[PDB]
Amino acid sequence: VNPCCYYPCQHQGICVRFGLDRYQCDCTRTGYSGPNCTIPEIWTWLRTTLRPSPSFIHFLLTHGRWLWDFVNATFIRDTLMRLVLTVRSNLIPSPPTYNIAHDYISWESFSNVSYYTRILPSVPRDCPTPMGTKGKKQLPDAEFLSRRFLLRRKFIPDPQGTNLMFAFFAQHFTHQFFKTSGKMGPGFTKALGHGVDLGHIYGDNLERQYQLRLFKDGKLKYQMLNGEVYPPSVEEAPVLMHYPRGIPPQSQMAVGQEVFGLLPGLMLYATIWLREHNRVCDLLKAEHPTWGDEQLFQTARLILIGETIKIVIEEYVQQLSGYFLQLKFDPELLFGAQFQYRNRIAMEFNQLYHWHPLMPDSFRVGPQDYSYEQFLFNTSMLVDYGVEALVDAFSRQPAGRIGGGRNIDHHILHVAVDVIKESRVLRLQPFNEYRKRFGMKPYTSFQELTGEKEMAAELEELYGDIDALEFYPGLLLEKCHPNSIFGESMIEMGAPFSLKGLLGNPICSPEYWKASTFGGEVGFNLVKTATLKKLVCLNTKTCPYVSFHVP
Ligand X SMILES: *[C@@H]1O[C@H](CO)[C@@H](O[C@@H]2O[C@H](CO)[C@@H](O)[C@H](O)[C@H]2NC(C)=O)[C@H](O)[C@H]1NC(C)=O
Please report, as ranges, the residues that interact with ligand IMM according to CB under 6 A.
Answer: 84, 88, 317, 320-321, 323, 327, 352-353, 490-491, 494-495, 498-499
Using CA atoms, how far apart are residues 3 and 7, in angstroms rounded to an integer? 8
43 binding a copy of itself? (CB under 8 A)? no
Contact 15, 3 (CB under 8 A): yes
Residue 183 in the binding site for a copy of itself (CB under 8 A) = no
* Of the candidates 464, 529, 520, the residue with the CA atom closest to the CA atom of residue 138: 464
- To the nearest whole angstrom, how small is the minimum distance from the Cβ of residue 238 to a copy of itself? 22
Whole-number Å distance between alpha carbons of 520 and 371: 47
Least Å from the CB of residue 467 to ligand NAG: 12
Three-class secondary structure of residue 94 per DSSP: coil
Q: Which of ligand IMM, ligand X, ligand HEM, none lies near 73, with the C-beta cut-off 5 to 8 A by kind?
A: none
Residue from 16, 26, 35, 418 touching ligand NAG (CB under 6 A): that is: 35
| Residue 162 β-bridge partners | 549
Closest alpha carbon to 158 in 424, 360, 418, 323: 360
Task: Please report, as residue ranges, which positions from 153 to 212 form the binding site for ligand X (by CB under 6 A).
Answer: 184, 206-207
User: Residue from 12, 30, 36, 505 that binds ligand NAG (CB under 6 A)?
Assistant: 36
d(CA 17, CA 166): 46
Q: Which of 6, 175, 341, 372 is catalytic?
A: 175
Whose Cβ is closer to ligand HEM: residue 443's or residue 486's?
486
Mark the segment that binds ligand HEM (CB under 6 A) among 118-126, 146-154, 324-332, 355-363: 355-363
Helix (H, G, I), strand (E, B) or coil at 205: coil
Please pick, from the candidates 350, 379, 407, 539, the single residue that binds ligand HEM as defined by CB under 6 A: 350
Report, in angstroms and rounded to the nearest whole number, the Rg of the chain calculated over CA atoms. 24
Choose among ligand HEM, ligand IMM, ligand NAG, none what residue 6 binds, the Cβ cut-off being 5 to 8 Å by kind: ligand NAG
Q: Residues 102-121: x/- map of binding to ligand X (CB under 6 A)?
A: ----------x-x-------
Nearest to 307 by CA among 522, 540, 503, 526: 526
Contact 304, 535 (CB under 8 A): no
Strands (E), 427-523: none
Residue 533 burial class via C-beta count within 10 angstroms: exposed 0-12, middle 13-18, buried 19 and up: middle
Residue among 49, 111, 226, 380 that touches ligand NAG (CB under 6 A): 380
Q: Does 286 bind ligand X (CB under 6 A)?
A: no
**Candidates 230, 243, 353, 385; catalytic one:** 353
> Which stretch of DSSP H or E encloses residue 54?
helix 54-60
Binders in 161-190 for ligand HEM, by CB under 6 A = 167, 170-171, 174, 178-180
User: Could you say which of ligand X, ligand HEM, a copy of itself, none residue 95 binds, taking C-beta under 5 to 8 angstroms by partner kind?
Assistant: a copy of itself
- Residue placing its CB nearer to ligand IMM in the complex, 16 or 83: 83
Q: Which amino acid is at 427?
A: R
382-421 positions binding ligand NAG, by CB under 6 A: 384-385
Residues in CB range of 532: below 8 A, 6 or more apart: 311, 315, 546, 547, 548
397 binds a copy of itself (CB under 8 A): no
* Cβ within 8 Å of residue 275, ≥6 positions away: 229, 539
Distance in angstroms (rounded) separating the CA atoms of residues 288 and 303: 15
CB of 399 to ligand HEM, least distance (A): 8
| Cα gap 417→35, rounded to integer Å | 39
State the minimum distance, in angstroms, from the CB of residue 417 to ligand HEM.
Answer: 8
> Residue 498 binds which one of a copy of itself, ligand X, ligand IMM, none, with CB within 5 to 8 A depending on kind?
ligand IMM
Spatial contact of 254 and 271, defined as CB atoms under 8 Å apart = no
353 belongs to the catalytic site = yes
Residue 423 near residue 351, CB atoms below 8 Å: yes
**DSSP character for 154?**
S
Contact between 19 and a copy of itself per CB under 8 A: yes
Is 226 among the residues that bind ligand NAG (CB under 6 A)?
no
| Residues identified as active-site | 175, 353
Which spans of this chain sit near ligand NAG (rule: CB under 6 A)? 6, 8, 34-36, 38, 374, 378, 380-381, 384-385
Which spans of this chain sit near ligand X (rule: CB under 6 A)? 112, 114, 184, 206-207
